[PDB]
Design a binder for this molecule. Structure first.
Ligand SMILES: COc1ccc(-c2ccco2)cc1Nc1ncnc2[nH]nc(-c3ccco3)c12
Length: 299
């Protein structure tokens, strides 16, 4: 019986080394945890959404979601510290965000690494689909890098849980990225796993453009218009027509016609068997050297 459980950790065991980053909707801190008896240090990341009872209940359900998932492709919450505010604590990923990573090492990441990442994101998204929950905020920023060969998913601050007969969800209000939303979500504020398929397509578009901003010149409000026109995001340079077919099928009108995450795993894993066939990269033969090159690496 897989049920959630929250392990409370003492404030005297946390030594917040510094801060990590303030996302456009969140603030995260870097830390190093020391148990009171183990005498071993483990790097951790601390999220403190700062003070209102609406964001307090948001941390509640977010922590509930993050303390119940269990997958090597989904970063899991390990505990909650109790200070003046509520601290969420997960295991720290050394290499950090994937969006800023592919923006930093675009001339060193090969076609093999990009497809395996898409395979891993699809696996984690397929796992949280089997647990009957929608992420509602899947972007390249919310993807981290444990090792350059393994990525994870975080930030469940907008995730929701589906009931028994419930196969969808109705949003309270706005405050959603929109660029990663499906057209049905922009119009009627409805979220499904196929809306997560859309956001998955936008994430893959972010990875294949090495971190380009989708709908850059568009002033957000024009997104629903160009979506109704019939156009989507353009075709990335490295992507053949096959990969752009997968991404376009994640962005079509009917939600039921979008590919489930199961067949996305099968497709990108088949492409991962031959990376040179579907991505054309100038280098490929060269590889990046991670861990000696510090860059983003801290205890
Ligand atoms: C969007 O990124 C997050 C979103 C939420 C959390 C979090 C931590 C605890 C509860 O939520 C934590 C993170 N970030 C992380 N969580 C674990 N390891 C990490 N290494 N690097 C980061 C990171 C870099 C930039 C933003 O996050 C990170």
């Amino acid at each position: 019986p897989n049920q959630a459980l929250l392990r409370i950790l003492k404030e005297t065991e946390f030594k917040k080394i510094k801060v990590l980053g303030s996302g456009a909707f969140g603030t995260v801190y870097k830390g190093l945890w020391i148990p009171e008896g183990e005498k071993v240090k483990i790097p951790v990341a601390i999220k403190e959404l700062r003070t209102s009872p609406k964001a307090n209940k948001e941390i509640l359900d977010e922590a509930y979601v993050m303390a119940s998932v269990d997958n090597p492709h989904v970063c899991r919450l390990l505990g909650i510290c109790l200070t003046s505010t509520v601290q969420l604590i997960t295991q720290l990923m050394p290499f950090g965000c994937l969006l800023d990573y592919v923006r930093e090492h675009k001339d060193n990441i090969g076609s093999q690494y990009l497809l395996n990442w898409c395979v891993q994101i699809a696996k984690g998204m397929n796992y949280l689909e089997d647990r009957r929950l929608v992420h509602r905020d899947l972007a390249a920023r919310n993807v981290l890098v444990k090792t350059p060969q393994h990525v994870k998913i975080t930030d469940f601050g907008l995730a929701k849980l589906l009931g028994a007969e419930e196969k969808e969800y109705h949003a309270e209000g706005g405050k959603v990225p929109i660029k990663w939303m499906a057209l049905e979500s922009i119009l009627h504020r409805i979220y499904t796993h196929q809306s997560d398929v859309w956001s998955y397509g936008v994430t893959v578009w972010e990875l294949m453009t090495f971190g380009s901003k989708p709908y850059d010149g568009i002033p957000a409000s024009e997104i629903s218009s160009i979506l109704e026109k019939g156009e989507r995001l353009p075709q990335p340079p490295i992507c053949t027509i096959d990969v752009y077919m997968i991404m376009r099928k994640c962005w079509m009108i009917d939600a039921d016609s979008r590919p489930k995450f199961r067949e996305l795993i099968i497709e990108f894993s088949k492409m991962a068997r031959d990376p040179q066939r579907y991505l054309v990269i100038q280098g490929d033969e060269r590889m990046h050297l991670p861990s000696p090159t510090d860059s983003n690496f801290y205890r």
